[PDB]
Amino acid sequence: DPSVLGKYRAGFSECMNEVTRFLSTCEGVNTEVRTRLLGHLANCMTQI
Amino acid sequence: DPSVLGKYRAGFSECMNEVTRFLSTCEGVNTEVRTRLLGHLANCMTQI
Numbered sequence: 001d002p003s004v005l006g007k008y009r010a011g012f013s014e015c016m017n018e019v020t021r022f023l024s025t026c027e028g029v030n031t032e033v034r035t036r037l038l039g040h041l042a043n044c045m046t047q048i
Numbered sequence: 049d050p051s052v053l054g055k056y057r058a059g060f061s062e063c064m065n066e067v068t069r070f071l072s073t074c075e076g077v078n079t080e081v082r083t084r085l086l087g088h089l090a091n092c093m094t095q096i
Binding site: 004007015022023041 | 071074076
């Protein structure tokens with residue numbers, strides 16, 4: 001059911017917002033981290 | 049169904065691992081960030 005996927009996406013939407021705050025806080029060695037950090041969450045959202 | 053919750057937890061388990069890597073990377077102004085970062089993911093896992 002799409003509700004399950006929506007719930008999953010909703011959870012990740014929340015993770016993305018908090019993760020974004022962390023990413024907006026770290027400004028040094030997070031260029032590589034940002035790629036994996038955003039890529040992974042994006043991959044999870046994209047995959048599901 | 050518990051499968052939905054398990055899927056949700058599984059997604060957060062994945063977020064926690066990646067988030068942990070970010071937290072293990074940032075070492076400066078993330079004491080406050082860590083509290084919210086871990087507290088939020090923990091809150092989501094705890095709540096669901």
